[PDB]
């Protein structure tokens, strides 16, 4: 997250760190959202590589013991069947991970609430991105979980020629694009939380930014729109 602020440690208890085994240690690669005690939602592109993955819930500082972490292996990966790794702009950038064990819920570990199917945010709706991704273009991962305020940019604007043009689809949400705050590598797969009728819900799964950099004016961060995939998610969980 570029241009973020450190999150309070109990603000975003559905945020997870997806990590891969790197020698004798583990490394953060992506974010995710806990959606059942044994299921995580993330981006498909985060699981393209044939790595050994684990999920960490209750994480705040990747480089210190917080006293709240639960570590759980990933047992099964279900990527959206239309996902095509060499065409992120086509969409379908979403995957579900079934955890080896069910995690225990507490003030640091909670299920993400999802929007009702079909819900679209009005232009300029208040949202936060969260994650441990790079804090500058071509920088380094954050230590502590970051948040940044990114108002939504509706489809009519986001799909206009000076923004993303045809690359953005109605199955996506765009947010930010102010040139200061954005998602960045390592934030992929994590949540866009938007305040609707008094309650934060996870409306986006972080999908992509510009190749010209993370915080680029008129290139808002692009998220998979969770509300387009409610039936898919329920179908997967009910059949696994
Ligand atoms: Na930690």
**Ligand 1 centroid – CA 69 distance (Å):** 7
Domains of the chain: 1-12+112-227 (2.40.10.10), 13-111+228-240 (2.40.10.10)
Task: Outline where the chain has alpha helix (H).
Answer: 155-158, 230-238
Q: Tokens standing for 144?
A: 């502590």
Resolution (A): 1.5
> For residue 65, how many other CB atoms are within 10 A of its CB?
7
Cα–Cα distance measured from residue 70 to residue 9, given in angstroms and rounded to the nearest whole number: 15
> Is residue 61 a known part of a binding site?
yes
User: Distance of alpha carbon 55 from its chain centroid, rounded?
Assistant: 14
Which residue among 17, 80, 93, 193 is the active-site one?
Answer: 93
C-alpha count within 13 angstroms, C-beta hemisphere, residue 112: 30
188 is catalytic: yes
| 3-state SS class at 228 | helix
Distance, CA of 218 to chain centre: 20
93 is catalytic: yes
Q: What gap in Å lies between CA 21 and CA 75, rounded to an integer?
A: 15
Residue 205 dihedral angles phi and psi, to the nearest 5°: -115, 115
Chain-centroid distance, C-alpha 235: 21
CB-based contact 171:224 (threshold 8 Å): yes
Residue 152 backbone dihedrals phi, psi, to 5 degrees: -65, 155
The reply to whether 65 sits in an annotated binding site is no
Sign of CA dihedral 235, 202, 57, 86: positive
User: How far apart are alpha carbons 206 and 131 in whole angstroms?
Assistant: 10
| Residues paired with residue 221 on neighbouring β-strands, in sequence order | 175
- Largest separation between any pair of C-alpha atoms in the chain: 48
- The DSSP output letter for 119 is -
| CA–CA dist 223, 203 (Å, integer) | 8
6 annotated as belonging to a binding site for a ligand:
no
**How buried is 110 (Cβ within 10 angstroms: 0-12 exposed, 13-18 middle, 19+ buried)?**
middle
Q: 47, 95 in Cβ contact below 8 A?
A: yes
Under 8 Å CB-to-CB from 149, ≥6 apart: which residues? 126, 127, 128, 181
Residues 28, 45, 60, 193: which is the catalytic one?
Answer: 45
Q: How far apart are CA 123 and CA 159, in angstroms?
A: 13
Centre of ligand 1 from the C-alpha of residue 61, in Å:
4
**Alpha carbon distances (Å) from 2 to 15, 99, 109, 187:** 17, 30, 25, 10
Q: How remote is the CA of residue 207 from the centroid of ligand 1, in Å?
A: 25
Identify the active-site residue in 14, 125, 159, 188: 188
Is residue 154 among the annotated active site residues? no
């Amino acid at each position: 997250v570029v241009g973020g602020t450190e999150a309070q440690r109990n603000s975003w208890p559905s945020q997870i760190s997806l990590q891969y085994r790197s020698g004798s240690s583990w490394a953060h690669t992506c974010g995710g959202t806990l959606i059942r005690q044994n299921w995580v939602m993330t981006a498909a592109h985060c699981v393209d590589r044939e790595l050994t993955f684990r999920v960490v819930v209750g994480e705040h500082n990747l480089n210190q013991n917080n006293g709240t972490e639960q570590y759980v292996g990933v047992q099964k990966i279900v990527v959206h069947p239309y996902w095509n790794t060499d065409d992120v702009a086509a969409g379908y950038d979403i995957a579900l991970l079934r955890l080896a064990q069910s995690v225990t819920l507490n003030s640091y570990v909670q299920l993400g609430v999802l929007p009702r199917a079909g819900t679209i945010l009005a232009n300029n709706s208040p949202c936060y991105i969260t994650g441990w991704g790079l804090t500058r273009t071509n920088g380094q991962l954050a230590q502590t979980l970051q948040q940044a305020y990114l108002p939504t940019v509706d489809y009519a604007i986001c799909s206009s020629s000076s923004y993303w043009g045809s690359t953005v689809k109605n199955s996506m949400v765009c947010a930010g694009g102010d040139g200061v705050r954005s998602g960045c590598q390592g934030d992929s797969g994590g949540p866009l939380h938007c305040l609707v009728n008094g309650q934060y819900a996870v409306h986006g799964v972080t999908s992509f930014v510009s190749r010209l950099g993370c915080n680029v004016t008129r290139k808002p961060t692009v998220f998979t729109r969770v509300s387009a995939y409610i039936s898919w998610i329920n179908n997967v969980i009910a059949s696994n």
